[PDB]
Each structure stands twice: as structure tokens, then as C-alpha cells.
């Protein structure tokens with residue numbers, strides 16, 4: 392009798408510029424500079 | 426929300442899952458899932474455990 | 475982290491100090507410091523207080 | 524004494540100050556990475572337009 396929660400992930404993503412730490416692995420990334 | 430929905434019926438150890446003191450079957454999984462769970466039926470079941 | 479390390483054994487009074495019902499010695503202090511503490515050994519001692 | 528973060532300690536049987544270095548050092552690495560990100564100066568080269 393137990394219940395569990397959470398979220399997901401992917402095997403590969405893209406490191407993204409961030410305010411805090413440069414190069415954070417994210418679950419999906421788009422492009423802003425064509 | 427799941428903390429206040431379980432209330433005293435499930436004191437959580439905090440390793441990513443909640444420990445239900447009383448019995449909670451597949452229907453009770455579904456009732457917590459669609460946030461219609463009421464612990465008034467199982468409060469006295471889970472209090473003494 | 476301190477909340478689900480100490481569980482119901484240590485209650486909160488409103489200062490940040492934790493009212494542990496077990497007599498927390500120096501080994502207990504180090505164990506709750508370095509993420510080693512388990513509720514199962516001491517919940518029997520901390521339940522009745 | 525733990526840095527730009529800290530977990531000071533006070534007891535009743537074992538009175539003294541400790542330091543939770545595990546999250547503190549990660550926090551200092553985050554702040555210093557932010558510092559090295561922003562204090563990183565650009566590569567643009569201005570010229571002398573006006574006299």
C-alpha cells in the first residue's frame with residue numbers, strides 16, 4: 392500500500408545557457424537564432 | 426495537495442513515495458489520481474496502524 | 475530534507491529547532507547531519523511521547 | 524564559517540557549530556559560475572569614432 396509520483400527524462404537533450412549555470416541538460420531544446 | 430489529501434492516514438517517509446497506513450486498492454489509487462479521495466472512511470483504519 | 479529525515483519523531487515548535495522525542499545523542503546528531511538516520515529504529519521510542 | 528551559505532549548529536548535549544558542506548559547496552559553485560558568466564567580458568572591439 393504505497394503511492395509514488397515524479398516526472399520523466401530523456402536519454403539525450405541539449406545543454407542550454409541559463410542565468411545560474413551555463414550548460415544545463417534539458418529534456419528538449421528549440422532554436423532561437425536561425 | 427496529495428499531502429493534505431492523505432492527511433494523517435499516510436505519514437510520508439519522503440523517498441519519493443507515500444506510505445499508506447490503511448488499505449488503498451486500485452480504485453483508491455484512481456480516487457487519489459482524480460483528486461476525489463476522502464479519508465473519512467479510512468481515518469480510523471489508519472490511525473491505530 | 476530535515477523534515478523527512480526526522481519525520482514525526484521530531485516535531486516543530488516554531489524557531490527552527492526540532493523537538494526530537496528520542497534522546498538524540500552525539501551519534502544521533504551526526505547521523506541526522508550526514509543523511510544516515512532511519513525512522514524505523516526509533517519510531518517505537520518516539521511514538522509515545 | 525562556511526562561505527556565502529551555511530548551516531550553523533546548536534545542540535543541548537553536544538553544543539558546537541557544524542557545517543553542511545554538501546549543499547553549500549554546490550551553492551558556492553553556482554554563485555561563482557554565475558560570477559564567471561557575467562564578469563566574462565565581451566569580444567567586441569570599439570573604435571575611436573569621435574575626436
Ligand SMILES: *[C@@H]1O[C@H](CO)[C@@H](O)[C@H](O)[C@H]1NC(C)=O
Nearest residue numbers: 400401404418419420421422
Ligand atoms: C522537441 O522540440 C522540437 C522542436 O520544437 C519538436 O520538433 C519535437 O517534437 C519536440 N519533442 C518532444 C518529445 O517534445
